[PDB]
Design an enzyme around this catalytic site. Structure first.
Site, PDB file in Angstrom:
ATOM      1  N   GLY A  18       2.998   9.231  -3.200  1.00 15.76           N
ATOM      2  CA  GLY A  18       1.632  10.101  -3.457  1.00 15.76           C
ATOM      3  C   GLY A  18       0.391   9.027  -3.059  1.00 15.76           C
ATOM      4  O   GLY A  18       0.388   7.833  -3.483  1.00 15.76           O
ATOM      5  N   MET A  19      -0.382   9.479  -1.997  1.00 22.28           N
ATOM      6  CA  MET A  19      -1.639   8.685  -1.540  1.00 22.28           C
ATOM      7  C   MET A  19      -2.919   9.629  -1.919  1.00 22.28           C
ATOM      8  O   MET A  19      -2.700  10.747  -2.009  1.00 22.28           O
ATOM      9  CB  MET A  19      -1.575   8.590  -0.112  1.00 22.28           C
ATOM     10  CG  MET A  19      -2.040   9.513   0.568  1.00 22.28           C
ATOM     11  SD  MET A  19      -1.675   9.643   2.617  1.00 22.28           S
ATOM     12  CE  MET A  19      -0.104   8.655   2.543  1.00 22.28           C
ATOM     13  N   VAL A  20      -4.078   8.905  -2.036  1.00 23.09           N
ATOM     14  CA  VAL A  20      -5.513   9.798  -2.207  1.00 23.09           C
ATOM     15  C   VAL A  20      -6.042   9.667  -1.165  1.00 23.09           C
ATOM     16  O   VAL A  20      -6.344   8.520  -0.267  1.00 23.09           O
ATOM     17  CB  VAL A  20      -6.181   8.842  -3.544  1.00 23.09           C
ATOM     18  CG1 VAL A  20      -7.318   9.727  -3.655  1.00 23.09           C
ATOM     19  CG2 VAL A  20      -5.329   9.211  -4.796  1.00 23.09           C
ATOM     20  N   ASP A 130      -3.066   3.879 -21.975  1.00 19.08           N
ATOM     21  CA  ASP A 130      -3.230   2.750 -20.741  1.00 19.08           C
ATOM     22  C   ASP A 130      -4.788   2.838 -20.473  1.00 19.08           C
ATOM     23  O   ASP A 130      -4.965   3.100 -19.304  1.00 19.08           O
ATOM     24  CB  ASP A 130      -2.332   3.423 -19.572  1.00 19.08           C
ATOM     25  CG  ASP A 130      -2.014   2.068 -18.485  1.00 19.08           C
ATOM     26  OD1 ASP A 130      -2.488   1.035 -18.798  1.00 19.08           O
ATOM     27  OD2 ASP A 130      -1.829   2.394 -17.208  1.00 19.08           O
TER      28      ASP A 130
END
Length: 316
Positions: A18-20, A130
């Site tokens: 997954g990339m943005v 987190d």
């Protein structure tokens, strides 16, 4: 296809890496952020993706990143990727702290938004686990939104520098308030307060500032490997907050002290933090909502569950 492949509908027009990717929303006529997720071969990724989608779809809050749209194939057979569309955010607190001094007013405003979002999260029986600067997104008018519920857990079921002492020695909601306390420290000085180089080093850094825990706090640590570890360490005296942060608002340090309290049972609650004198300009419990709908498998079932969770965004 309109590139690897980053295939996002008619609605999402321009594109920047997954990339943005940033992209132009042709309906809402604002630009947006799009995360391409490809999790389906890996039970682990299906888990994180499902959790993050189930949580973000249930949540509606100004200080929690929403899901505006989800793009996927109309069938499970054709669904290889999922595209998650979110509000485009100028920056995150990690990038901001790398080059910008924060005014007292910005520290106060950021802290208030973090706590307001966290109150909502906790009210839904969710632990973020987190919280860190890179998971706090800011727009150009300093509106703040909490990111990334992939690691989140139900209250009945991470990144070293923000980890509470009890994670190393022993758990509850109190984990998240410690992380917020670490973030406030980081906003005051533009440097991580506890930059541990390994698991036990993080404890040495905490005790270097807080001093050795009291007999009363150690009496609470029933695990013998953990207690004996703490007893094996050389004595350290407390370093006063005003020595570390000579410029800081004394109300900010009072609140910091209560967030960075070794014993999680003595640590300030999120709602008590919101009601602290430091946040008096912002505090408004009727404008600090709680969740309407608090929370209560192989690859193939999780893929099917992700399909079902995402159905609402399909043309039907």
């Amino acid at each position: 296809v309109r590139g690897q492949v980053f295939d996002v509908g008619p609605r999402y027009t321009n594109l920047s890496y997954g990339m943005v990717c940033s992209a132009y929303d042709n309906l809402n006529k604002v630009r947006v952020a799009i995360k391409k997720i490809s999790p389906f071969e890996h039970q682990t990724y299906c888990q994180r993706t499902l959790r993050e989608i189930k949580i973000l779809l249930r949540f509606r809050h100004e200080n929690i990143i929403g899901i505006n749209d989800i793009i996927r194939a109309p069938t499970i057979e054709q669904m290889k990727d999922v595209y998650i569309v979110q509000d485009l955010m100028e920056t995150d607190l990690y990038k901001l702290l790398k080059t910008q001094h924060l005014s007292n007013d910005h520290i106060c405003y950021f802290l208030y938004q973090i706590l307001r979002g966290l109150k909502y999260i906790h009210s839904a029986n969710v632990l973020h686990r987190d919280l860190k600067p890179s998971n706090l997104l800011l727009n150009t008018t300093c509106d703040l939104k909490i990111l990334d519920f992939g690691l989140a857990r139900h209250t009945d079921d991470a990144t070293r520098w923000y980890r509470a002492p009890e994670i190393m020695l022993n758990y509850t909601k109190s984990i998240d308030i410690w992380s917020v306390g670490c973030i406030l420290a980081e906003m005051l000085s533009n440097r991580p307060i506890f930059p541990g180089k390994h698991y036990l080093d993080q404890l040495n850094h905490i005790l270097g500032i807080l001093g050795s825990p009291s007999q009363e706090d150690l009496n609470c640590i029933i695990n013998l490997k953990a207690r004996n570890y703490l007893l094996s360490l050389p004595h350290k005296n407390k370093v006063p907050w005003n020595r570390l942060f000579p410029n800081a608002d004394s109300k900010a340090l009072d609140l910091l002290d209560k967030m960075l309290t070794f014993n999680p049972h003595k640590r300030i609650e999120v709602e008590q933090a919101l009601a602290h004198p430091y946040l008096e300009q912002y505090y408004d419990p009727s404008d600090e909502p709680i969740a309407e709908a608090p929370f209560k498998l192989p690859k193939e079932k999780l893929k099917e569950l992700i399909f079902e969770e995402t159905a609402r965004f399909q043309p039907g």
